Write a protein that binds this ligand. Structure first.
Ligand code: EHZ
Ligand code: SF4
Ligand code: SF4
Ligand code: SF4
Ligand code: SF4
Ligand code: FES
Ligand code: K
Ligand code: ZN
Lengths: 48, 209, 87, 96, 699, 119, 115, 129
């Protein structure tokens, strides 16, 4: 890389991270999509 | 060459296979129902189930056939037919440098004379056919499950048997022993219907009913 | 309580077994309705069905008088028999 | 950029963020909720709108074979700009 | 005797004279590739892919338009035809945009598939492709006009099946573009169908735009319940979610089309849903609660209160299984006030004779009639598919329609006979000139909309039209099998509800105020808490909480029409069934199982316990509710007519005004439609101008 | 070798916007069905995935995804040392994969730069 | 059509005969099998489980079918005799780990949409 | 025409006890015999020529993890193809499955004439081409 450094772009990280498994920096899988069914909101009015 | 992509086709092999197909057909008209040579020079002999043993014996022992090696013995499950199972034999003749295909048919409840007598290689192939599909073979020495786990229910390769199966396995700590439970997939197998609604090959256009 | 709530007639459109009820309904049905306008006589017909009569009584009860091959006079005599009892 | 949720959790570019009453949050405790910071929705906006004196253009995302398939955008509606579907770069006819 | 004989690929085929080459090839089974030729629409010839070689003929003929004659050997797979197909497709793919990864038609694109089968494997077009500016035609139709191939299928559909002439082709040469010139939304009840006919991704659906791929969705057949036509649809579900409702083919009910309210309404099924039982707390606020507590509270009030103090206003979206389950439950409580929101005249025969409330002449029978008479209805919005059938019969058979309601746009051209109800009596007496027309017509047809019966004078109108049918029935100009009187319904659960024996209308509730009223899917708001006696127990069993939810105490989450295997009966009498596309959300259960479980808790356990059992019970109440896809023809019109002669109700001076006169109020009808988001954009679009509906729509 | 198949990553254009346009070719051709994709119209117009999950314990690392991709969005990076202590850490979603694209970009860019001519 | 060649048995009588000694061959070794495999369960619940498995297959009224289960049970006996099935395979017959699925309609309605 | 110790086996084929299917998936499942309709997006007909067998759908929830569409019904993706209704309806009860059958929908032949596009009298004359 000293002779030929790779092309530089904004999104490329500026600090490499080693295997973060085990340490409290792991990757926890989770849903990346929002909810699907919108529950009907009951009316707070005391009705009648 | 004018066909740099199309696979070349041999007619001499086609004629030799066709001539032998007529030869076997005349020799045993009692079982040979129909015979055909595929486009890529492969011969298929359609026998009646009772002719499983006599036809194989003739191909194994005749001086003009000498098919002395059972390459494999498998069946294709086609539910739309009355006899869904379709047992297929593949033999190779070392002396004459040719291969033959002998295929029968069988429903669920019908035993087939095991070819262990003619080809001792069939012995283990027979167990696979019974285990995967359920076709029972009479006179088989040690007919039992070969591939599926002990106490397995059903026959997997049957088209009506679900791919994921009915039962999964898990180590249950309460009994301190690996146990069986009904299947519960974390992600269901996303079936893909990817058959184009446009006709592919006009050559095999089945005539309308 | 078993007071008459509804009478259901199931008849086939063209079956000879249900021919008799057809003879009844073209003639006597109108007069029956004038007699009991409040009564919901149901004539939900069908094809290839055995001509039967359902009579729904109060508290959810149902009789299953079957007028198979009954003639028009027979069908009428079965009807007044069912509604003879007001309860 | 990244917007924090009222419950105190980073919201992904897809808009995903666990509700305050959502039980499926204990996973993130003593760990970190993986989220990217370079929100592609934002970064594409900073790209200048190219101006070319032609009714139609050809965009391939640059790099030839390394880009997206070549498409042709019709820069005829002077009301707004034409953006390539694959990459999002805009184009505009300068006063036609 | 007229059948001329042709040789499709040599094999002899018997063809009716005038048959096109394409249909003759289809007789053997070979399907000639085509783009412009759609079976329902006219034949154009712009496709040029239907080209085929006729034996001993030097010119390749267009199979989409050439009528065969004696002794023709249509060489479908001849070399000359194959060269022609490759050449035509090469021209099509010459200027097509490279949008396959971003085009919704990807995976089900005729251009894609026909390229795989009849087309080359590369391109020799080393030029610059063309690009065409997009057009906006509404918040429903994705328009990427650069992908269009100018097959003019959309133009033909708009001018034939829709009736509105706003889609056309402007300019000549390669620069020719299909659109609407001046910016204007292409809005009609059948607008969304242009998505289906378009063979490419030029016209696609905005609500579903690039949310799924055709090879990954599971297609489940079902029956639409938004309207009373009961159009057959194919609900596509992936990973337990509903993306598309595609039309099916029936050739009688919906042909190959569906209404927009049928198509773009799945979004309603994912918004404002009832998923858990609700019981009011000490402050009268409906809070989440278990099923057992909800069933216990309802059961206790049902056991203590009996007689006629228990009622049930069944909605318009319910199924036959739920209707009979509630009927059996309240019958065991002696309650006979099973009511429906729709008000059908009970005077006379009423629900007794099945012929009284039906489209006896069937939907397909419209294409056979010669004179129709619509009374106080707007079929363009009450039953869009029925209106399309009327137009289809209007176009070909030259059938003459006639309207007595308010003058509204019906795509085709009618002859208004005035909107006064008294016109009906004039036709009965023969004073009106149209009465003579009905005598000469060989197959007259009279259609009375169910919306007209909603008026206070519904009985009088029904008696009037029945007299119209009687007057022309006495004249021998009508055949014996021809059923003249026809009633067109609007809500789905009306023929089934009236077939079961439910009292049409809601008058019994107000005339005998109950206190355990059962709101089964009721959302028309016909009954409020005021008309009910004080301290009324209201049980709502709907799926969307819109109107019937707030005015209740024991909300019971139900199953939507895509979440149950129901039995819906269309306005023509056909009793079709739906299939479970996806299970109900949350804790919501099937409607009939809810009532059966409720009866078990209350003590009066119902006999049936499975779907087959309740369907068998449905057969006992009405045998025609099991004969699926079979129109059980009714009869005894004279007996119904004689009963209507009894009693006397007089007409009124209020003109017959349909509830829906224009497009804007066609959209917002039912609970699912009301809760829909994509439908709100439509009503927003038609109300104001085009400027209020547009998005950066690219993929 | 530059053709080495390892940990997956989604790359982005030099502008910054992602390359994936959610054509689902990678999901359709995945032999083990390890790819799950959910798409939705983005706020700005041109729309990308809202869920792009790769099951790295179900992946066979065949590389069919990077061939099918018409925009070179999903690639198999040079890393092969992403072993983890827990099974859940393997089940990558869009965020982790996008992070990989922003981490191994300096290496993946050169690899395809040396191998694109062969393909 | 109504006639097809049989497996082993020509009618129900000999088919039932082949069931009886199969049950005999299953009764005798159950205490031996329990001893062999260190079964937690006692002998008694072993014997009726053989009885119950034989009992559930009672509606069969076809000689060819009964032969198939008869030969299939023979392999199951063979697998058990020569220690081919371990404790887990034997305990598979006793469905222990899974909770009892209730049979009343009310409970099914409470738990899910299962018909 | 086969003397192989032939006996009278009139009773219907009941192979259900051999296929290994658990008791639950053998009664409470209602299979459907139908000819699939053409994908309305397309116009080809090569997918509406074989009878299909499918099982009614069941619960499909979402995982507590990233949230795929989980399931617990093995007979969810099983789709079988039959060349004739009689073969299809025979495979159902032979395997012991309650079935409902929908008859094949054949697109009725429609007479189409190009000359009608330009008609002297009839309203079928088009206004554009
Ligand atoms: C040791 C650890 C594991 C322990 C657990 C081990 C469990 C599995 C043991 C193997 C079971 C075996 O497969 C069962 C089979 O093959 S066949 C069952 C009986 N089915 C028939 O024979 C069909 C015809 N049915 C009848 O003949 C009548 O039902 C009856 C039998 C009552 C006689 O009637 P008669 O008197 O009219
Ligand atoms: S319409 Fe879509 S799928 Fe068809 S060729 Fe054009 S871009 Fe490809
Ligand atoms: S928009 Fe579609 S239907 Fe209309 S002409 Fe173009 S390709 Fe044909
Ligand atoms: S490399 Fe892995 S993710 Fe890519 S297609 Fe193959 S199995 Fe699927
Ligand atoms: S193949 Fe590439 S562009 Fe297509 S969905 Fe997969 S990652 Fe996105
Ligand atoms: S099909 Fe005849 S030209 Fe398109
Ligand atoms: K389309
Ligand atoms: Zn671009």
């Amino acid at each position: 890389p000293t002779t030929k450094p790779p092309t530089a772009r904004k999104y490329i990280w500026t600090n490499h991270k080693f295997n973060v498994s085990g340490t409290p920096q792991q990757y926890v899988p989770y849903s990346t999509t929002r909810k699907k069914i919108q529950e009907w909101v009951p009316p707070s009015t005391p009705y009648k | 060459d004018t066909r740099p992509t199309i696979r070349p086709r041999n007619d001499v092999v086609h004629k030799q296979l066709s001539a032998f197909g007529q030869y076997v057909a005349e020799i045993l008209p009692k079982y040979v129902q129909q015979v055909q040579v595929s486009c890529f020079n492969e011969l298929e002999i359609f026998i009646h189930p009772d002719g499983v043993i006599p036809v194989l014996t003739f191909l194994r022992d005749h001086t003009n056939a000498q098919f002395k090696s059972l390459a494999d013995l498998t069946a294709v499950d086609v539910p739309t037919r009355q006899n869904r199972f379709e047992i297929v034999y593949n033999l190779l003749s070392l002396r004459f440098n040719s291969q033959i295909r002998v295929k029968t048919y069988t429903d669920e409840l019908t035993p087939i004379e095991s070819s262990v007598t003619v080809y001792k290689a069939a012995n283990w192939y027979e167990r696979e056919i019974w285990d995967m599909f359920g076709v029972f073979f009479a006179n088989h020495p040690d007919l039992r499950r070969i591939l599926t786990g002990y106490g397995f229910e059903g026959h997997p390769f049957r088209k009506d048997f679900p791919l994921s199966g009915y039962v999964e396995l898990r180590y249950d700590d309460e009994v301190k022993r690996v146990v069986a439970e009904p299947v519960e997939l974390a992600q269901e197998f996303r079936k893909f219907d990817l058959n184009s609604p446009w006709e592919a090959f006009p050559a095999y256009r089945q005539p309308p009913e | 309580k078993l007071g008459l709530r509804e009478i259901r007639i199931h008849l086939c459109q063209r079956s000879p077994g249900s021919q008799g009820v057809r003879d009844f309904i073209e003639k006597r049905y109108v007069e029956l309705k004038k007699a009991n306008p409040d009564l919901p006589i149901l004539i939900r017909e069908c094809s290839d069905v055995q001509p039967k009569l359902w009579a729904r009584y109060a508290f959810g009860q149902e009789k299953n008088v079957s007028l198979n091959n009954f003639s028009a006079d027979q069908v009428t005599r079965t009807l007044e028999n069912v509604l003879s009892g007001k309860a | 950029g990244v917007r924090t949720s009222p419950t105190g959790e980073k919201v992904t570019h897809t808009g995903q963020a666990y509700d305050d009453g959502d039980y499926r949050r204990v996973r993130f405790s003593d760990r970190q909720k993986e989220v990217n910071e370079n929100f592609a929705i934002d970064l594409i906006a900073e790209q200048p709108v190219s101006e070319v004196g032609s009714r139609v253009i050809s965009c391939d995302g640059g790099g030839g074979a390394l880009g997206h398939p070549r498409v042709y955008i019709n820069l005829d509606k002077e009301t707004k700009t034409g953006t390539c579907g694959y990459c999002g770069l805009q184009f505009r006819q300068p006063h036609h | 005797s007229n059948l001329i004989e042709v040789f499709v690929d040599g094999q002899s085929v018997m063809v009716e004279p005038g048959t096109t080459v394409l249909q003759a090839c289809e007789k053997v089974g070979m399907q000639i590739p085509r783009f412009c030729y759609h079976e329902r629409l006219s034949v154009a010839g712009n496709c040029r892919m239907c080209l085929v070689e006729i034996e001993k003929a030097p010119k390749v003929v267009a199979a989409c338009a050439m009528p065969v004659m004696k002794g023709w050997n249509i060489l479908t797979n001849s070399e000359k035809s194959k060269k022609a197909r490759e050449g035509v497709m090469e021209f099509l793919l010459a200027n097509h945009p490279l949008d396959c990864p971003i085009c919704d038609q990807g995976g089900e694109c005729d251009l894609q598939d026909q390229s795989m089968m009849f087309g080359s494997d590369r391109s020799r077009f080393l030029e610059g492709k063309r690009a065409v500016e997009d057009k906006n035609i509404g918040p429903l139709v994705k328009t990427i006009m650069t992908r269009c191939i100018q097959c003019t299928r959309c133009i033909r559909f708009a001018s034939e099946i829709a009736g509105v002439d706003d889609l056309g082709t402007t300019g000549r040469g390669n620069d020719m573009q299909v659109g609407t010139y001046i910016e204007k939304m292409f809005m009609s009840e059948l607008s969304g169908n242009i998505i289906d006919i378009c063979p490419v991704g030029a016209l696609t659906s905005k609500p579903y735009a690039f949310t799924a791929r055709p090879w990954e969705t599971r297609k489940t057949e079902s029956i639409d319940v938004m309207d009373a036509v009961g159009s057959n649809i194919v609900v596509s579900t992936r990973t337990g979610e509903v993306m598309r409702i595609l039309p099916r083919m029936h050739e009688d009910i919906n042909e190959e089309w569906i209404s927009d309210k049928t198509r773009f309404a799945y979004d309603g099924l994912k918004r404002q849903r009832l998923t858990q039982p609700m019981i009011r707390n000490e402050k009268g606020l409906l809070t989440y609660t278990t099923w057992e507590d909800a069933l216990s509270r309802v059961a206790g009030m049902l056991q203590s209160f009996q007689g006629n103090d228990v009622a049930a206003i069944a909605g318009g979206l319910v199924d036959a299984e739920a209707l009979v389950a509630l009927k059996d439950l309240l019958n065991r409580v002696d309650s006979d006030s099973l009511c429906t929101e729709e008000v059908f005249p009970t005077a006379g025969a009423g629900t007794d004779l099945r012929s009284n409330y039906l489209l006896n002449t069937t939907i397909a029978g419209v294409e056979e009639a010669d004179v129709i008479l619509l009374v106080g209805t707007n079929p363009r919005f009450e039953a869009p598919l029925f209106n399309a059938r009327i137009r289809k019969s209007w176009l070909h058979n030259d059938l003459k329609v006639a309207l007595i309601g308010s003058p509204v746009d019906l795509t085709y051209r009618y002859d208004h006979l005035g909107d006064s109800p008294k016109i009906l009596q004039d036709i009965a007496s023969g004073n009106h000139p149209f009465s003579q027309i009905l005598k000469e017509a060989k197959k007259p047809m009279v259609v009375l909309g169910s919306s007209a019966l909603q008026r206070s004078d519904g009985t009088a109108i029904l008696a009037a039209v029945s007299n119209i049918a009687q007057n022309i029935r006495l004249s021998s100009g009508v055949t014996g099998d021809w059923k003249v009187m026809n009633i067109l319904h609007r809500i789905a659960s009306q023929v089934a509800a009236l077939d079961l024996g439910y009292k049409p209308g809601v008058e019994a509730i107000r005339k005998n105020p109950p206190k355990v009223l059962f709101l089964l899917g009721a959302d028309g708001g016909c009954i409020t808490r005021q008309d009910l006696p004080k301290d009324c127990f209201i049980i709502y069993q709907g799926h969307h909480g819109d109107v019937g939810a707030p005015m209740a105490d024991v909300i019971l989450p139900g199953a939507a029409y895509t979440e149950k295997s129901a039995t819906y009966v269309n306005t023509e009498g056909r009793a079709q069934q739906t299939k479970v596309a996806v299970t109900p959300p949350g804790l919501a259960r099937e409607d009939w199982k809810i009532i059966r479980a409720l009866s078990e808790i209350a003590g009066m356990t119902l006999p049936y316990d499975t779907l087959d059992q309740v369907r068998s019970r449905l057969e006992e109440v009405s045998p025609n509710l099991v004969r699926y896809d079979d129109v059980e023809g009714a009869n005894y019109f004279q007996q119904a007519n004689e009963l209507s002669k009894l009693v006397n109700q007089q007409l009124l001076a209020d003109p017959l005004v349909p509830p829906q006169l224009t497009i804007k109020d066609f959209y917002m009808t039912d609970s699912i439609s009301r809760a829909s988001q994509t439908m709100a954009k439509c009503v927003k679009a038609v109300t104001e101008g085009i400027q209020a509906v547009e998005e950066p729509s690219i993929c | 070798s530059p053709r080495f198949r390892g940990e997956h990553a989604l790359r982005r254009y030099p502008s910054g916007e992602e390359r994936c346009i959610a054509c689902k070719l990678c999901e359709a051709v995945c032999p083990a069905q390890a790819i799950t994709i959910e798409a939705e119209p983005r706020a700005d117009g041109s729309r990308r995935t809202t869920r792009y999950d790769i099951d790295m314990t179900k992946c066979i690392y065949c590389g069919f995804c990077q061939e099918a991709c018409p925009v070179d969005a999903i690639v198999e990076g040079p890393n092969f040392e992403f072993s983890t202590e827990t099974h859940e850490e393997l089940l990558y979603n869009k965020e982790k994969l996008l992070n990989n694209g922003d981490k191994w970009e300096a290496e993946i860019a050169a690899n395809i730069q040396a191998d694109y001519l062969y393909r | 059509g109504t006639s097809v060649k049989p497996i082993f048995s020509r009618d129900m009588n000999e088919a039932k005969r082949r069931v009886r000694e199969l049950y005999r061959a299953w009764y005798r070794e159950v205490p031996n099998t329990v001893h062999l495999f260190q079964l937690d369960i006692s002998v008694k619940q072993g014997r009726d489980k053989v009885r119950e498995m034989f009992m559930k297959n009672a509606h069969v009224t076809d000689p060819r079918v009964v032969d198939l289960l008869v030969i299939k049970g023979k392999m199951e006996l063979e697998e058990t005799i020569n220690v081919w099935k371990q404790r887990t395979h034997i305990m598979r017959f006793f469905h222990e780990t899974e909770a009892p699925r209730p049979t009343d309609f009310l409970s099914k309605f409470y738990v899910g949409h299962d018909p | 025409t086969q003397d192989t110790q032939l006996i009278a086996v009139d009773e219907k084929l009941d192979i259900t006890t051999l296929t290994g299917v658990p008791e639950e998936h053998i009664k409470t499942r209602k299979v459907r015999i139908f000819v699939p309709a053409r994908n309305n997006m397309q116009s080809g007909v090569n997918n509406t020529k074989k009878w299909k067998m499918e099982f009614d759908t069941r619960e499909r929830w979402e995982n507590p993890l990233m949230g795929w569409s989980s399931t617990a019904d093995p007979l969810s993706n099983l789709v079988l193809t039959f060349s004739t209704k009689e073969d299809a309806v025979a495979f159902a009860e032979k395997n012991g499955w309650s079935f409902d059958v929908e008859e094949r929908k054949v697109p009725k032949p429609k007479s189409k004439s190009y000359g009608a596009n330009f008609s002297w009298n009839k309203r079928t004359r088009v206004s554009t081409k």
